[PDB]
Design a protein around this ligand. Structure first.
Ligand code: GH3
Ligand code: GH3
Ligand code: MG
Ligand code: MG
Ligand code: NA
Length: 367
């Protein structure tokens, strides 16, 4: 009969969960500003390296002179051996390769939650907002993997040198600048593309494969198609599931993309009503454990691994994730049946953290 309704608690843009999660325009503009700085520097580093290559096209300069030239650019912020390597790579280029490099101008495209608007304000101390800004290198389906990575690293490392409180982190799939004071990091995955999703190649930092075909547009188009198909509330509930994950784990938990994929599957196959996103979240929560136990398939069919493994592959971390997923619909049910508004709030905040504090967003209802 009587039940607490949480639709405002979730959706209210003043001080409900959407209000707590969505970045303000100032914050978004700050991120855009950070993105521009990184893009400009990467553009500049490539122009600088191209200037050296241009000089070598004109005259077959000695190795020591090429090295000296490298030392005057932003590449000076790489290690000595890495500078030697860039100089050696420029020295060793054949005419064809050098011409291709002289024709290369990096392009950029943001992928991930800043692009499709699911980027949440961070919650726990230590957690950071993420901007995924890819750099793209148009090439014949002729510039080498090593040189390209060194130049993008030169870019990021040169900014890290100039800015107090910025730090560089090498990842398998990107370079990363972390800005702890701003609770932000920017990831720069690097792609080779033709000068056709099959030809978008993501550079890998280590291993048996230098490249793998992984077009971020596949996920972006899948998600935006899903939003059109299911409704705008898809973005809201994905934000909320990510907020749940940030509240349950300081570090770790299921990936954002696994939560998106499982949520889309559920909302495509189970009736729900966007006029009550509290019920919609309860419905999602009821079905997530089965989605995750069987393994969460990627929306990109070319991915070699699922986004979350099936339960026969579970270790302590996946077991912990299954446990918290199993608890979530119980938390939501108990909040619905709580004795008072204040207890309803206390209970639902055990799912999403103590972010929403306004118990007037919770209203007595019937269901
Ligand atoms: N095909 C594929 N793409 C991935 C995978 N992981 C990340 N990506 C691509 O990178 C994009 C950004 O990934 P994330 O930073 O992990 O997710 P997000 O949507 O930005 O969420 P968050 O706000 O937590 O950063 C999404 C997708 O295009 C994956 O496992 N497979
Ligand atoms: N296109 C693509 N980008 C990925 C993939 N995995 C990670 N990325 C990009 O690298 C960034 C760092 O990845 P993680 O480390 O796994 O976090 C996130 C995203 O921008 C992937 O499978 N495909
Ligand atoms: Mg991201
Ligand atoms: Mg990232
Ligand atoms: Na939980």
């Amino acid at each position: 009969r009587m039940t607490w309704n949480f639709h405002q608690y979730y959706t209210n843009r003043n001080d409900g969960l959407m209000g707590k999660l969505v970045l303000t325009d100032e914050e978004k503009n700050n991120l855009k500003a950070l993105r521009k700085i990184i893009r400009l520097r990467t553009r500049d580093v490539f122009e600088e390296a191209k200037g050296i290559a241009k000089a070598v096209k004109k005259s077959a300069l000695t190795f020591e002179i090429i090295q000296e030239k490298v030392s005057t650019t932003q590449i000076k912020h790489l290690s000595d051996s890495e500078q030697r390597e860039v100089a050696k790579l420029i020295y060793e280029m054949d005419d064809d390769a050098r011409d291709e490099f002289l024709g290369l101008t990096p392009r950029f495209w943001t992928q991930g939650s800043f692009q499709y608007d699911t980027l949440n304000r961070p919650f726990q101390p230590g957690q950071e907002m993420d901007i995924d800004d890819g750099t793209y290198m148009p090439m014949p389906i002729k510039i080498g993997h090593s040189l390209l990575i060194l130049l993008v690293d030169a870019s990021l490392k040169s900014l890290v040198a100039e800015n107090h409180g910025w730090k560089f982190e090498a990842k398998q799939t990107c370079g990363r600048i972390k800005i702890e004071a701003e609770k932000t990091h920017i990831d720069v995955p690097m792609y080779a593309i033709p000068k056709g999703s099959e030809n978008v190649n993501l550079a890998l930092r280590e291993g048996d494969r230098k490249w793998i075909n992984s077009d971020p547009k596949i996920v972006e188009d899948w998600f935006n198609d899903s939003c059109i198909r299911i409704g705008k509330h898809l973005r809201k509930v994905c934000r909320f599931m990510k907020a749940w994950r940030d509240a349950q784990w300081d570090v770790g938990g299921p990936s954002s993309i696994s939560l998106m994929a499982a949520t889309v599957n559920i909302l495509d196959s189970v009736a729900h009503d966007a006029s009550d996103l509290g019920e919609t979240m309860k419905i999602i929560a009821k079905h997530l454990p089965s989605e995750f136990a069987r393994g969460v398939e990627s929306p990109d069919s070319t991915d070699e691994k699922p986004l979350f493994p099936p339960s026969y592959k579970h270790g302590p971390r996946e077991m912990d994730i299954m446990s918290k997923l199993e608890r979530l619909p119980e938390i939501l049910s108990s909040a619905e049946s709580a004795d008072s508004k204040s207890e309803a709030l206390k209970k639902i905040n055990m799912a999403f953290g103590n972010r929403v504090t306004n118990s007037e967003l919770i209203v007595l209802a019937k269901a």
